Amino acid sequence: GEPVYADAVLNGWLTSMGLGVEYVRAEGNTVYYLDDEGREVPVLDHACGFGSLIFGHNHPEIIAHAKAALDAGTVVHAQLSRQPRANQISRILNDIMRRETGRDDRYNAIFANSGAEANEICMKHAELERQERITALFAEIDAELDTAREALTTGTATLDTASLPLVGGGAGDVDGVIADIHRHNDERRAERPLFLTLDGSFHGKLVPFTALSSPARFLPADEPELIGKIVEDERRSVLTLSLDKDTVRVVERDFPVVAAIFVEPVRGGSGMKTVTPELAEELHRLRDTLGCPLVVDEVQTGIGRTGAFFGSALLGIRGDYYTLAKAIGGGIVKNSVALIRQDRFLPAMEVIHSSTFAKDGLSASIALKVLEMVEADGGRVYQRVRERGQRLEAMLESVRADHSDVVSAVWGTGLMLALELRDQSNATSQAIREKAAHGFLGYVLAGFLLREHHIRVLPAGPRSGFLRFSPSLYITDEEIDRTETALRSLFTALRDQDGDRLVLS
Amino acid sequence: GEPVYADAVLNGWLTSMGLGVEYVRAEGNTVYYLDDEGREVPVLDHACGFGSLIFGHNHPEIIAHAKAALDAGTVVHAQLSRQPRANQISRILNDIMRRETGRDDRYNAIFANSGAEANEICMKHAELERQERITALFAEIDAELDTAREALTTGTATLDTASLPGGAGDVDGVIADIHRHNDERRAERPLFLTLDGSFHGKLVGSIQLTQNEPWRTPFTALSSPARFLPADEPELIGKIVEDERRSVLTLSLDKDTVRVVERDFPVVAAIFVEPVRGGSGMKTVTPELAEELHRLRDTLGCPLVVDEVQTGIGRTGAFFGSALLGIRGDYYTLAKAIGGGIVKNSVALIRQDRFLPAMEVHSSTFAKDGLSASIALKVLEMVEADGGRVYQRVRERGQRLEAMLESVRADHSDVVSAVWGTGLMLALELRDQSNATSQAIREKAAHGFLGYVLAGFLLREHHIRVLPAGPRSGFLRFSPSLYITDEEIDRTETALRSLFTALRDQDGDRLVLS
Ligand SMILES: [Cl-]
Ligand SMILES: [Cl-]
Ligand SMILES: [Cl-]
Ligand SMILES: [Cl-]
């Protein structure tokens, strides 16, 4: 019971999973810990900052660039001055998306410190768009009411009394029905925006903390045919008086309820599942139907990792807004960006977002270096990601084939891959069964891989039911062979229900 | 109409304010831009990343440490492994607060990437505490309902007060109505109280990059409800909070009578206070306000969250502004200066006897990174060196800067209303210029841009970088490094006397670019 100042519960839980190690150095695909003699033990890193390290730990070019930037006296803090590097970064991202989608679309960039903050920038801009739509709708309703009033206070038109139940609340005189319409409409306008998201994703603030964020409706990614009815149930109306020749009727007008649709091209939280063509088509339909933006959240993938810069370009997701974070800090610094199609972009938004660290000089310099590296030699790097990915996936598919009793599937694309583990909650071995019941099986399997094979793997998905494989593009054939050996060993032990060997006492 | 990919509105606005410059290099208190010949023009920086650069731009010790850390192959990304530097950083902050407050209290640390994210961690942990309180209250109401039912199906009568839910008066029906009334209260979102806080100011959209409009709250529907308490009028705060009281219902058994009665519900998740309010022009918490917040915290049972992310460690003349001003918080947030002016790091400190350990086990890939952790340990070594000499330096430099600003205020009280702040976190309040005789000045004041126009004059004419704060850019900030020289403070004095003479003379031609 000695004083602790951080991580006592984290460190105790890591120790029980077999993941209580301290890494003291890292280079490429290798992290090192110290044995009891204090020698560096190399460990192969398949987590790689959850796919941030597409160039690996501490890439010599990124390290040399960061030191050159510091040696130049780069202005890190230049808030409310001209920083041309923001526009240079955005120009490159615009050119890359134009090439990958074949669409001549232009995007404004707003920079931030984390994936969640870039996603939050999109929630704010989306809510300013919804408010512009509400303003336009309410101006039109105001004009419709004044035309209807001027006709009902002269010869011009009948107020059709059969229309009055749509307001419901006494009044039968003109000024009274209109007062009740204003009140009904003011209530709808007071309601919080709705965000549409997919089961297995979170987007910054969007998901015991429901009460901290805007309402979200979670849609089933696996059943795009169910999505239509779910969203149809969120329809709401405001009221107006419509003059049709000689007749005023009270009518329903659709209200902008939904501020935005969020989608990740690859859902880490679903075990590295990619958006299907069917789902992409349903989100396109939703976006076209609601008039809200489709926000494509790529902050959790890592630029280039799917085999294209934009996973969305690869999967044909036609977004209005895009977010990036992972890999743009070169595995040393923190940067994120919201890209908002210029024909939707509200100029006000450029001077709304206020963050001290955002758009800093150091991470801007590092981002321009990363974009040079990822674009070098006519896009060879994307070719390498695709070739390394095919090799890694073939190995995982080969392990799945011989171990289908405990591995259900291979998921993902490029160098963003996972194995799905079959449920072990009915396991023979008490120690395995108990860990599976608490949702920790993936963590204990990862512990085995560390202690017996010196391989760093971390789980993904609900109840640690998947193993992530997201190494750098420098992963060697030999490193993939050692991983295969480690997984055959792991899945044999799990097949044989060896709880003594897999779960630490 | 050439294609532009970022900053077209920002850059156009900066140009019109006289602030359209690109700084290409920085060291200490100096940023450099290029003249038309491409030679470096030195500019004195009183903004210093809004007070982040307590050690100035690119401090040689911090730069040398950061390069050594990169050369050593520091593990930046080690998520779900042992990272003892987090515990080492927390231990130092714990020891510093112990020394500055004299209280032997312990705090758990949770790291994030920005001041806003450290503040958000406090909102989350506060809301877990409120839910524990709700659980305990509802357990007690459950037992009170079971006692009341068992007595009303034996020997006791219910009194009239069915009003508070008031139909049939039968046992199962009154209880059903109580469950329903209580389920509604329990569904309500938490309320946050803030003392004109910059955190909730930014969250609701009142505080923006280039303006502060308390009347403009476009994003309230994206966040938990916030009630803004008037920091200037602590005597009004009690009644405002009294009006936020809400009740759940229970059955109270007294001898042979069961009555429906109201019990207090935990409405408020947390109280947020900044020791120095940047957004209100560097105003410090008064003893009277501190006492009112202590009372509120003790009365509500919610944490007092002390947000120091916008101050900068050491800048008030103590490490913790809260220690200096006697604010006894439950949670504390830091960000500015802990990244050494080169990287991004923030920390939430939560009193260990309130701390819910769930809170520390994934929020953010970048959080608790190895590089910013190494740099934070270097900054803490630097700020603590030589028996706290650096806090002594901040206090001495601050006193010199404040005396200069007070002497400018004295001779220019027609256009400068006050000096605010403490240590090297200072501001001048400008009087409103909405009635200015100069049309060019009056128009800029009507758009809330007076402070930015004045800052443009200081850049153009005196090569001094100042940035305004507060509603209608009505304050000028002074937050340089502790290395600011006597001659740099003299040049600033000269620049301000020149500026306020031109404003006195309503010289719109000189102050506002055509
Ligand atoms: Cl280390
Ligand atoms: Cl990165
Ligand atoms: Cl470059
Ligand atoms: Cl900093």
Author numbering:
A (entry chain A): 6 to 212, 226 to 523
B (entry chain B): 6 to 170, 174 to 369, 371 to 523
Quote the study that presented this structure, word for word:
Previously, the biosynthetic pathway of the immunosuppressive agent caerulomycin A (CRM A) from the marine actinomycete Actinoalloteichus cyanogriseus WH1-2216-6 has been identified, and the critical role of the (S)-selective ω-transaminase CrmG in the biosynthesis of CRM A has been reported. CrmG catalyzes amino acceptor caerulomycin M (CRM M) transformation to caerulomycin N (CRM N). Moreover, the activity of CrmG is insensitive to inhibition from ketone α-ketoglutarate or pyruvate.
The crystal structures of the apo form CrmG were determined to resolution 2.10 and 2.85 Å in space group I222 and C2, with one and two dimers in the asymmetric unit, respectively. Interestingly, in the structure of apo CrmG in I222 space group, the two catalytic pockets of CrmG dimer show completely different conformations. One catalytic pocket adopts the conformation similar with that of apo CrmG in C2 space group, in which the catalytic base K344 is exposed to solvent, here we name it “open” pocket; whereas the other catalytic pocket exhibits closed conformation, in which the G213-S232 loop acts like a lid covering on top of the catalytic K344, therefore K344 becomes inaccessible to the solvent. The closed pocket is more ordered than the open pocket. Residue W223 from the closed pocket forms a cation–π interaction with R451 from a symmetry-related molecule, indicating that the closed pocket might be stabilized by crystal packing. In addition, in the catalytic pocket of the closed apo form, residues S206-V212 form a helix, whereas this segment is a loop in both open apo form and cofactor-bound active form. However, in both open and closed apo pockets, the V317-I321 region adopts a more relaxed conformation, and Q318 occupies the position of the aromatic ring of PLP. To our knowledge, although numerous structures of ω-transaminase have been determined, here, we firstly report a closed form catalytic pocket of apo ω-transaminase with the active base inaccessible to the solvent. In apo CrmG, the active site is dynamic, which might switch between open and closed forms.
